[PDB]
Each structure stands twice: as structure tokens, then as C-alpha cells.
Amino acid sequence: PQITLWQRPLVTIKIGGQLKEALLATGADDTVLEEMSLPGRWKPKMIGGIGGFIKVRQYDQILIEICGHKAIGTVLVGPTPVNIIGRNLLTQIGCTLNFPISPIETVPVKLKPGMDGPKVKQWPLTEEKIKALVEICTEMEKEGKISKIGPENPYNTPVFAIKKKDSTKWRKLVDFRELNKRTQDFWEVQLGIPHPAGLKKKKSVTVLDVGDAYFSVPLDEDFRKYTAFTIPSINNETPGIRYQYNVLPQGWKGSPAIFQSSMTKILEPFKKQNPDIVIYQYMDDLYVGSDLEIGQHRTKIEELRQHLLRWGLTYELHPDKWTVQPIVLPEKDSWTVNDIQKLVGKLNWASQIYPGIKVRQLCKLALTEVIPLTEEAELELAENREILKEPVHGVYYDPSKDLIAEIQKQGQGQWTYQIYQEPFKNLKTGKYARMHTNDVKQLTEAVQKITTESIVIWGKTPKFKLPIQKETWETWWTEYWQATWIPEWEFVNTPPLVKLWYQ
Amino acid sequence: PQITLWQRPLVTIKIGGQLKEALLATGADDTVLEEMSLPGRWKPKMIGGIGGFIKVRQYDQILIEICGHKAIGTVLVGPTPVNIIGRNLLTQIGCTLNFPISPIETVPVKLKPGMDGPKVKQWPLTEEKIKALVEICTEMEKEGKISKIGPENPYNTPVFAIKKKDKWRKLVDFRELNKRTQDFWEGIPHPAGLKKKKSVTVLDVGDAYFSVPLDEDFRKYTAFTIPIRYQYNVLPQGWKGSPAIFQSSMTKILEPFKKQNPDIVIYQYMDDLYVGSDLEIGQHRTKIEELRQHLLRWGLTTPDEPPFLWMGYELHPDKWTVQPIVLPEKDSWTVNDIQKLVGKLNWASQIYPGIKVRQLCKLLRGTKALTEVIPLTEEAELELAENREILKEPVHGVYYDPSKDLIAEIQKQGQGQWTYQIYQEPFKNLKTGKYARMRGAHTNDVKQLTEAVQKITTESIVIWGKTPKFKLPIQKETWETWWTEYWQATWIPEWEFVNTPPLVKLWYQLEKEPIVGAETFYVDGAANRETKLGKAGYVTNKGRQKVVPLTNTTNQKTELQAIYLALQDSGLEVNIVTDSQYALGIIQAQPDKSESELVNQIIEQLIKKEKVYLAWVPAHKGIGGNEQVDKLVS
């Protein structure tokens, strides 16, 4: 039973066939009882208390029933005011000291009403990945970070160990996409207002991982059950070690929500002394921006790292150089009938983006020969070309709806993407290029770069419409992903004309 | 944290800068310290200990950090032998005394929310069998297994008597009980994934479910009446919740023995304990004797050879096989046994593919009675029989040696039939399988090869964990062309071609440049709804055309038909301009099999052509072509 310490923990003990009450003592070495007859020979001994030393008779291997549990141990008979159960008999039972926290009590964590914890089965993993994951997870449990569970917890979220940088050390990720979606209500209680709009203008934004901060702020107990994962074993030989997170997770939506007030305390000196720095955070990462020369930007990066580690926490990204790629139209010296047909087929699609497009002259109509363009078609077409080569119009951000990221392949080591909130009206358009290599790596790098830009510019990961079979992605997406977050993706099985349209 | 009392439970204590350690004393009502730095004023106090009494200096509102937990409380300073953390500061923290555990541990189990069952009136039995029920019950109780609850428990579940052969074995129907149990975590170990071990034995646990205790607090939900209410205290012999807790208990009890013996490898699925080691048999029997004694320690009972029967796989000195799996046969089968035979077929599905019992499962699931002789369908029964006839095939294989790489190989039999031969040495199959089309509507052979590789890789990572080196048949030039030109993203791990008389290739290509002199042919299509009154044709550079009335006129069908009409009357080098994105998309995927003989006719036609080039136009626009039959429908 669990005994509160408001009162003395005396328990019924049976000695030499007798019912009596002995006080369980945690600071008592041996066991001292009242004067009574004990079987076998005894040895004269003395014990020190808070008043001096008393003469006691030592009886070894003596039978005692503590709280109805049999114990055989040395028993000391002496002139003691309180019958006492010492650690010597307490160990035989296995009496233990159990500890709770007084100063810090995790803030409650809640779910959207009528929403159960995530139940998403884990996809298979490679042998080296599981071999390293076991090491990482067991080391974590050795430091008290996670505790193993049985079968009473039906929830589960997938896991995969990755390598973020060139450093030869794996780190695990938990796909909390379902848990973040379920616990979306707990974000509404705490909004980060305002999101920094100055990061969009910085000359250099450095991403510093601050995941380790959450390891010191424990979770509200009733929600611990929801964070469970299984590290499966090859060939399903051993069933699979299922743990629960005791400290806060990394990818959980509330993981920074709990730590927001705690951290901003630590950042107060920094924002106090150099306002031109904009420091903004996401699920695991710290973005620090400074529209300075890179020489001292890198200088304050080091000082920020030292400041963070001093209080116990722990390619380059350039928003200015980021540019919006327009759409261009061919202007061959002598086009042929095929070229006008293709150009019209492309252009009539463009009206869904730039409304001020008129082609009625162009469609005015061999295809082995050139057809010189008519003058009124010339002028109208040029006017349209000017219109197309101008910033997009009548578009802005509605923060009430999520964001959609659509990637389309150009098939020569190049990629193009469109970032939109509603169809035919796109926020950001750009290309990704890297010059014969692997193919899945290209989308994964492209997805990561899209999401980094999206985090900087509108501060949330959009929903992807990937150009790959779901079966293909589910196998080799984790091979080449270096990022703590995970974006929501849906799979596309229709080739449109947009791929030919854009580039 | 939990602290054992084997040595004194000292914890770190910090007094305003001062580091030091104090002894957590449950008996020491007050916290007593040898010294405090610069404490200043203190009221005199008298405290008693074992031997006499002592004057002490009392300090109030002291903020002290004990073992990482803050406490603000009175701290005494006196001539104590050791620093003493009293119950006064212990209650500021949460420290409590846990006392001796009993025998074993019980995994906590709870019901699904918002449920207060179960309750089903047991259809009263008769005395001849009731005698058997009583006889079982008395001995079961004296074994400390099932206890006669108090009549205050209000629930009941049925019990039947079964001969256990095809004599009145006990069974309790937990069909309604399973509907309220909380969910629990529930693959299969393939024979292909057993490493060679020169000494092998398989031990069966002597009904070990009768050794792992069930929740004493959950026992209220598994009563047992004989029409004398009883109650299970260990795992039910048929509860679907039992396997999980049984496996968990087996793991927890095996962990120490495994720990003290890293060399041995121990598996356990249902009742078998596959123990293997490379030690000599003379040594291995002694080590297995150690294993059995340790198993008995925790209350488990162990009952009481070139073949070995492990999980239905027959282990052999250098090979493995599956004991032929067959079913009982009768005109009508016992319903509960049918609930067993579905499980046996389910298990055989992993060993041997081509097993579907979904209809048989539905016929059972809808039915919930035993009094009426349950009718069985002839169609699903014949499906079962034909499935069994295929199930007459002895599998084989050999043990995996990780020192040698896997080498797979796929071969194209025909029209959507493939092979999955896997091996590490020639002519020693590790596992053999077959693959067929999944969509069944539109596909191509190269895409099928890629999908087959994907399936093989998934299965291989499941079984052994390392992806293999495929030996595909396709030519490398063809694979590179298709992967560089196809719109989607596909990868194949390291592989080499292997030359076989059948091979995979892309039959045809669609040209990327319109062809000089080729009779460019314009096509168009439309359809109606009230009477399917839409017609098709083509319009040509010279103006030849034909509109032939069509039945079951459908818009996508018409768009397809427009191309074929022209392709039939076209020579070698052709250009086709179509106003359908859909027809263009279907054609240009370079498919080879489709449910449409119209699509297949186009494929066979286009095979003959030498230079075919397709382009697209916007609809409902005048582009100087189809205007000749723009008036087709309106």
C-alpha cells in the first residue's frame, strides 16, 4: 500500500506469535522492538539514537509479519519507546521511498472534444536504423526521459531515426502529425502574436536547433499515455518495445507552447540589448535574423549560442536573395504553325492567373513552313507579354485557411513549385535545381526547402501534393530527410499541363 | 525515484549555497542538521533519540533543496550523528513508503469507456454434462484458479462442453465480453528468417495461461454459472485479450535468463519456446535444463529428434518446410470449429498465398446462434475447396546466413504474372512468390516491374531487414529511358540485368517532333446524355473523314474513339491532334494492357506505325482545323 507521511507509518507486525504495531522507520538501520521473549541465542550490542546509546539483545533470522508480509531478519530487543521496523527488514519486504514534485506541476493538456489519441501503425525500418534507435531510446530511459509501457495503451505514433547534419550520430523523430492535429485546440489557448514579419526582410536567418530545451519541463500526467511509440524488431521476433514520453516531446504542437513563457524569459536580455535581431521559434528550431553584414551576423550567432548554453539550453538561408520567378514566352525569329498552336495552348491557361489576357488576334489561324505573324497580333501579343512579366495581382494572405504546396517535376534535374492557398492564385513560385543523381533525394530536398521558406515567410508548414506514388514515398522518404518537423502530404496521380506551362 | 534500502538513503541537500548530504529518515519526525552556515538566531528545543535526549537549535522557514525537490520548513541544528531529513520536510516533498510486493505482477486492464456489461443468460444445460462441469470446477478451484464469487456479482456467460476431438472440455463464450475490453497492441516469424544453430530444441509451456495471473479487480466480468457462480483468476483459455498479456509476462520473465546468456536465442509465439544455440548438445541440454528450472521458478510449468515442429514449421538439419495443413471435412461443420478453421486458414495465408475467406467470415459474423444447423453456401464452400487444392503444395527453404548477401530475381511469365525467387546461393530458394496486377485497368510492364521491386523490398525489409540486390530482366537502356522520361519519381536499388528468353521492353514511343510530310490528322469528339447521341470521326489535311454511328456513346469513350478511327486509316508516319486531355493522357502513358479492347486495338494498331506524334489543342476554340466538323453535335 502507499502510506502518506502526514502521520507516523506504524503497521501491524506479528512477533513470536504476537500481534503488535511497529513504526516503519526509513532512517533506522537495524530493527529494534520492545522487550519480549525471542528464540535462539542473542548477542549484546549498542545502538546510537538522537539521545545517546542503548543496550540491545541481537536475535538473528527471527520471524516477523509486517503488514501481513513474512520477513526473516536480525531483530534487536532494547529499551526503545517505539517498536521500529528498520531498513534491514524493510528491504526484505522491499519498502521504498517514492518521490513527487512540489514547485513545478505541468500545465494541463487537453484534446478536442470527441477526439481519441492517435492510433497509427509504424512502417518497417532498416536494420541499422533499428540497431541505433535501440541505443538511443535505452539511453533515454536510463536518464529518466521515457518509461516503458504494456499493452493497455492502444495509441501509437511512428518513429524513425535520422541524421540531421554530417555529424555521425543518429537522432529519432516521432511523426506527431496525428497528435498535433488532434491537440490543435491546445494551441488556441496560446497564440504567438504577432508573428515576426521582419524575418521576411532579413539579410541572413540562421536556424539553431533548441529541441533539448524541452527535456527539463515534464508533461501533465494524464496526457503522457498519448505519446507512445514502438521500435519494431526485424521479422517480428520480439514483439516490440513500446515506451511512453515522460518529458515533453519534440514534434508535439504543445511542446513549444509549454516552453514559450519559460524561454522568452531567457531571451529577455537579448531582445533588450540588440533590437534589430528578430528571434522566432518553431517546433524545434530558433530562427535568428540580422540585416547586417554577414561578418558580424555570424559574430552574434556565436554569442547567442553562448548565451543559450550559458543558461542550460542548447548552404545559408537568405530571404533577401529569395525571388519570385515569372513566366516567359518564346520569341523565335521564325516560328512555325506548331509553335503558335503550342503557344496558344499555353497562353489560354494563363488567363486563369493573369486575367488581362486576350489572344483573339493570335488564334487567327503549312506546319512544315513558317507563318509570319500578323502585325495586330504582334502588338497584342507584345502587350500580353508585358502583362505576364509583372508582379502577380489581386492576391494576399487569408490566415483563416491552411496553405497548399504543389510540386511539379521538370525532368532534367530541375523542379518547379507553386505555393497557393486557393487554386489559380499563388503566393510564391520558384524552382529547385541541382545538377544523373538520385530522384527521391531531389523531392525530399525540395520539400525541405519549400517548408523552410514557408516557415520563414508565413510561419507554418503547408500541405503538399507530391508527385510520387505513396508506396514509393513511404519507403525512401526517411532515408534523406534532415529536419525535425514533418509536413502533411497528399499524393497526386494526374499529370496536368502545368508542368509544361511553367518552365 | 524508487530507492532500495540496501544502503543508507542519503540525498543531496543545499542550504543557501552550501552543498551537503542528509539521511532521509521516516522516523525522524523533524529534520536535524550538524551545522548551518551563518544561520544567526535560533530558539532552543529539546528532542529525544535512542539513548537519551539532546538540546537543538530550531531554524524556521529554511528553504532547502532535498534530492532535487524544494522544501521550505523548520530545520533543527543539533549534535546528530548523521544529517537527518525529518518527516516534516519529507511531507513537503512527496516521499512515501512502498512496502513488500507479493508474488508476481499483474498488468492493469480496464474496460472500454461507457460500458457496464457483460450479461447474457446462459441457455440452461442438462445434468449429464453438468456433472462434467462440476468435476472440472472442483479441481480447477482446488488448484487456486477459479473462485466461487459472492452472489452480489450480477453477470454471467455461457459454458459449453466439447469432446476436444473430431471429452466435455470446458469452454466459455466470451463473444460479448470481447466487445468491451480496452484495445491492446496486437507480423509472423517466417521460416526464412532463422539463422543456423547447430543445437536446437523447442519447449512447449504447459498451458502457461493458467500460470500468469489475471487482474483480480477485473475478475468481476468473467463469471461462470452451472445451471454455483465461479470466477476466473488467471487468463481465460479463449479470451482474445489473453495472448497479449501472456506474451508480455513471458517477456518479463525471460529477460533475466536471456541477459545472463547472450549467446542463446529464444523465440516464443503461442506456446513454443524456440531455444537455439551453437553449443554442443551435451552442453546444450544442460543449459536448457537451467532454462527449465528458471522457468519453473516463476510458477510456470514445463511438461515432462531430427524433426522439430515450431509454429507449424518443421525445422530440419539444413532445410525447412511446412507441415501440410489440412482441415476437417463434413457436410455441415460445427460452428465454433468453423470459428477455428477461419483462424487456421488465416494463418496459412501468411505461409501460402491465395487464401480468401471473407465471405465465410461474413456468414459467421452475421450468425450468432448454435441451435439451428447453420447453412453454408455452395459458392464459398467450393472456393474453400479449390483454395485447399492449391494449398496442397510443399514449401521449402533454407536458413538465412547474414554473412552472404541476398540476391533476388523476377521473371515475366505473361500478361500480369511474375515470380519472386529469393536466394543467397544458386538453386537454394530462400523464399518464392508471385505477383500480379493490382489496378487491373491501365498499366505497363515496366511500371509493373517497378511495383514488383517495391513489394519485394518491403517484404525483404520485413523479413531480414536488409534490402536485396535484384536481378531484373529489363535492359538498362530501356530502364534509363523510362525513368528519365516518365513524369513521376521511381527508384530501384542496386541491380543487374539477367538474360532470359522473355524480357520487358516499352513496345512503342510517341514522337517528340511533328514529322515532315506526315498526313497530320485532326480528331474531335462529343457525346450527349438523353439518348447517347454523340458521333465521332476525324478531319484530315486532305479532308478524308468518316463518321460512323456509335453505340453506348460516352464522352471519354468518344474522345478515345476519335483517335482510333483515324489510326485505322493511317499509314506509317502520322500526326494526330486531339482536343482531349484525357485521351492524350491515357495513350501517352505508354500502356500495354487495359480492360478496353478499344484501347487494346489502338495499342495493336500503333505497334504497326513507325512514327506517331500526338499533340493537344484547347476545346471550343477555332484553331483552323476541326472547323470542318465543328458543327458535329450542336
Grid cell locating B465: 531487414
Task: List all residues 6 or more positions away from A496 whose beta carbon is below 8 Å from its beta carbon.
Answer: A408
With beta carbons under 8 A apart, name residues in chain A contacting B84.
27, 50
Q: Residue A50: which of B6, B54, B248 has the nearest Cβ?
A: B54
> What is the rounded CA–CA span in Å between residue A229 and residue A155?
8
How far is the alpha carbon of A358 from chain B, nearest alpha carbon, in Å? Answer: 13
SS3 track for A105-151? CCCCCCCCCCCCCCECCCCCCCHHHHHHHHHHHHHHHHCCCEEECCC
- Residue B74 pairs in a beta bridge with none
How many Å apart are CA B291 and CA B460, to the nearest integer?
A: 33
Backbone phi, psi, residue B271, to 5°:
-135, -10
> How many Å apart are CA B156 and CA B121, to the nearest integer?
7
First-to-last CA distance in chain A?
73
Q: φ and ψ at B294, to 5 degrees?
A: -65, -35
Q: Do B109 and A152 touch (CB under 8 A)?
A: yes
- Domain spans in chain A, listed from the N-terminal domain onward: 106-189+215-255, 190-214+256-326, 327-396, 397-503
Q: Round the CA-based radius of gyration of chain B to a whole number and report it.
A: 39
* C-beta separation of A466 from A494 below 8 A: no
Q: Which of A390, A386, A333, A339 is nearest to A362 (CA)?
A: A339
Q: Report yes or no: B595 and B515 within 8 Å, Cβ to Cβ.
A: no
What span, in angstroms and rounded, lies between the C-alpha atoms of B159 and B165?
18
- The cell numbers describing B187, all together, are 507480423
Cell of B308: 522439430
Distances (CA, A) of B407 to A11, A222, B404, B424, B425: 69, 50, 9, 6, 8
d(CA B80, nearest CA chain A) in Å? 6
Verify whether the Cβ–Cβ distance A475 to B463 is below 8 Å: no
Residue B471 makes CB contacts below 8 A (sequence gap 6+) with B407, B408, B409, B410, B495, B496, B497, B498
Rounded Cα–Cα distance for residues B322 and B191 (Å): 9
Nearest-Cα residue of chain A relative to residue B89: A5
Q: Which of A93, A341, A368 sits opposite B100 (nearest CB)?
A: A93
Backbone conformation region of residue A437, classed left if phi is above 0, alpha if psi is from -120 to 50, else beta: beta
Strands in A282-399 per DSSP E: 285-289
Give DSSP secondary structure letters for B471-528: EE-S-HHHHHHHHHHSSS-----SEEE---SS---------SSPPTT-EEEEEEE---
Distance between CA atoms of A252 and A326, rounded to whole angstroms? 38
CB-CB: which of A230, A234, A341 is closest to B623? A341
The answer to whether B90 and B13 are in contact (CB under 8 A) is no
Residue from B493, B400, B50 nearest B194 by CA: B400
Q: Which residues of B touch A367 (CB under 8 A)?
A: 514, 520
Scanning A200-318, the segments in alpha helix (DSSP H) are 221-224, 254-273, 294-310
Please state, in angstroms and rounded to a whole number, the distance separating the CA atoms of residues A209 and A283: 10
CA distance A484 to chain B (A): 24
DSSP state, residue B246:
H
Q: Which residue in B292, B289, B288 sits closest to B197, CA to CA?
A: B288
Q: What is the DSSP string of B293-305?
A: HHHHHTT------
Cell of A74: 536480525
User: Based on C-alpha coordinates, what's the Rg of chain A?
Assistant: 34
Closest by CA position to B292, among listed B275, B310, B279: B275
Looking up cell 544453430, which residue turns up? B197
Q: In 3D, which of A334, A332, A400 has the Cα closest to residue A370?
A: A334
User: How many angstroms separate the CA atoms of B109 and B177, rounded?
Assistant: 14
Q: How far is CA A431 from CA A327, A462, B130, B404, in A?
A: 12, 17, 80, 44
- Set of cell numbers at residue A45: 550490542
d(CA A251, CA A227): 11
Helix (H, G, I), strand (E, B) or coil at B49: strand
> Which amino acid appears at position B278 of this protein?
D
* Cβ atoms B352, B395 nearer than 8 A: yes
SS3 per residue for B56-112: EEEEEEEEEEECCEEEEEEEEECCCCCCEECHHHHHHCCCEEECCCCCCCCCCCCEC
CB-based contact A36:A77 (threshold 8 Å): yes
Classify residue A193 as exposed, middle or buried by CB count within 10 Å of its CB (0-12, 13-18, 19+).
Answer: exposed
The DSSP H or E segment spanning A428 is: strand A425-433
Cα separation of A148 and A138, whole Å?
Answer: 10
Q: Residue holding cell 549560442?
A: A305
Say whether A338 and B23 touch across the interface (CB within 8 A): no
Instruction: Please report how the helices B358-366 and B335-351 are oriented relative to each other, as an axis angle in degrees rounded to 10.
Output: 150
A93 → chain B, closest CA residue? B100
Experiment type: cryo-EM
CA distances from A214 to A121, B129, B130 (A): 26, 64, 63
Report the phi/psi class of residue B605: left, alpha or beta, with left for phi > 0 and alpha for psi in -120 to 50.
Answer: alpha
Taking residue B181's Cβ as centre, other Cβ atoms within 10 Å add up to 18
* Total residues belonging to chain B: 634
C-alpha distances in angstroms, A311 versus A215, A263, B12, B291? Answer: 14, 10, 22, 52
Q: CB-based burial of residue B315 (10 Å sphere; 0-12 exposed, 13-18 middle, 19+ buried)?
A: buried
Phi, psi angle pair for B533, to nearest 5°: -95, 70
Choose among A3, A48, A239: nearest Cβ to B50. Answer: A48
- Contact status, residue A386 vs residue A378, Cβ threshold 8 Å: no
Describe the crossing of helices A294-310 and A254-273 by its angle, rounded to 10 degrees. 120
Q: Are B573 and B611 in contact (CB under 8 A)?
A: yes
- How many A/B residue pairs have CB atoms within 8 Å? 285
SS3 A503: coil
> Beta strand pairing status for B495-497 and B470-472?
parallel
Grid coordinates standing for B272? 513454443
- In chain B, residues with a C-beta closer than 8 Å to the C-beta of A92 are 100
d(CA A336, CA A343): 11
Resolution, in Å, please? 8.2
Per-residue DSSP letters for A476-488?
HSGGG---S----
Interchain pair A95, B92: CB under 8 A: no
What value, to the nearest 5°, has the Cα angle with vertex A158 and ends A156 and A163?
150
Residue A141's alpha-carbon distances to A135, A144, B298, in angstroms, are 10, 5, 26
Phi and psi dihedrals of A98, rounded to 5? -115, 130
Beta-strand (E) ranges in B155-222? 159-162, 169-172, 199-204
Please report residues of B whose CB lies closer than 8 A to that of A352. none
The span from the CA of B486 to the CA of B633, in Å, is 36
What are residue A460's phi and psi, to 5 degrees? -170, 150
Nearest CA in chain B to A230: B185
**What is the identity of the amino acid at B336?**
N
Cα distance from B295 to chain A (closest Cα, Å)? 18
CA distance B126 to B138: 18
Locate A218 and state its grid cell. Answer: 515534464
Measured in whole angstroms, how far is the alpha carbon of residue A59 from the centre of its chain?
60
Spell out the SS3 assignment of B384-395.
Answer: HHHHHHHHCCCC
Give the separation between CA B593 and CA B585, rounded to whole angstroms: 15
d(CA B347, CA B335): 19
Q: For residue A490, what are the contacts with CB-CB under 8 A and spacing of at least 6?
A: A463, A464, A465, A466
Helix or strand or coil: residue A253? Answer: coil
Q: What is the Cα–Cα distance from A87 to A95, expressed in whole angstroms?
A: 8
Chain B residue numbers with beta carbons less than 8 Å from the beta carbon of A100 are: 93-94
In sequence order, which residues have a C-beta less than 8 Å from that of residue B379 and are 6 or more positions away? B359
| Cβ contact A354:A391 at 8 Å | no
**Residue carrying the nine cell digits 543487374:** B496
Question: What whole-number distance in Å separates Cα of residue A287 and Cα of residue A281?
Answer: 6
Broken C–N links (> 2.5 Å) in chain B, after residues: 166, 186, 227, 304
Residue type, B577: V
Q: Which chain A residue has its CA at the smallest distance from B54's CA?
A: A51
Cβ proximity of B442 and B591 under 8 Å? yes
d(CA A406, CA A420): 8
Q: What residues contact B169, with CB distance under 8 A and at least 6 apart?
A: B161, B162, B163
| d(C-alpha B141, C-alpha B229), whole Å | 12
Residue A336, min C-alpha distance to chain B (Å): 11
Nine-digit cell string for B338 = 468453423
Q: Cβ neighbours of residue B513 under 8 Å, at least 6 residues apart?
A: B613
H or E element at residue B344: helix B335-351
What is d(CA B107, CA B322) in angstroms, rounded to the nearest whole number? 35
Q: How far apart are the first and last CA of chain B?
A: 84
CA-angle at B127, arms to B122 and B133, nearest 5°? 65
What residue type is B232 in one-letter code?
Y
Residue B382 C-alpha cell reads as 467450393
State how far the Cα of B16 lies from the Cα of B64, in Å rounded to an integer. Answer: 7
Residue written as grid cell 513511404: A474
Of the candidates A379, A375, A350, A345, the one whose C-alpha atom is nearest the C-alpha of residue A363 is A345
Which candidate in B2, B3, B5, B246 is best for mutational testing of the A interface (most A CBs within 10 A)? B5
Which residue of chain B is at minimal alpha-carbon distance from A493?
B488
How far is Cα B534 from Cα B530, in angstroms, rounded to an integer? 10
